[PDB]
Design a protein around this ligand. Structure first.
Ligand SMILES: Cc1nnc(-c2cnn(C)c2N)n1CCCn1ccnc1
Length: 115
């Protein structure tokens, strides 16, 4: 509350640590479905169904251009990638499996780095 400061969790390395996590996501062998935006012209249903598309390249652009106010907004975008994937792809499809793998991969990194 006013003039009553809760102790300051050190966020000075968050940008660098998120960047390192994203690099590891980007270079994972199962990242291939998530590297670029889904092509909304060529993939039926996606534009109408997936209200907030997201992908690694877009996250990287946002991270590099100061568009994440904090680490939680970054993690929400990463999760959105995988939440979209689950909405659209069957769990045992290649892309659906890729998504489940990447989410697990992401969340261990997230917990280890920040929790
Ligand atoms: C991510 C994601 N979720 N669904 C798709 C997709 C794209 N095309 N099709 C038929 C899908 N189900 N994606 C992007 C996968 C983009 N891709 C395809 C081959 N290499 C990358």
């Amino acid at each position: 509350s006013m003039s009553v400061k809760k102790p300051k969790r050190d966020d000075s390395k968050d940008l660098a640590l998120c960047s390192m996590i994203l690099t590891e996501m980007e270079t994972h062998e199962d990242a291939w479905p998530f590297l670029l935006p889904v092509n909304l012209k060529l993939v039926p249903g996606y534009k109408k169904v997936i209200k907030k598309p997201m992908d690694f390249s877009t996250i990287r652009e946002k991270l590099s251009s100061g568009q994440y106010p904090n680490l939680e907004t970054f993690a929400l975008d990463v999760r959105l990638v995988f939440d979209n994937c689950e909405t659209f792809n069957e769990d045992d499809s290649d892309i659906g499996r890729a998504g489940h793998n990447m989410r697990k991969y992401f969340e261990k990194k997230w917990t280890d780095t920040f929790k």
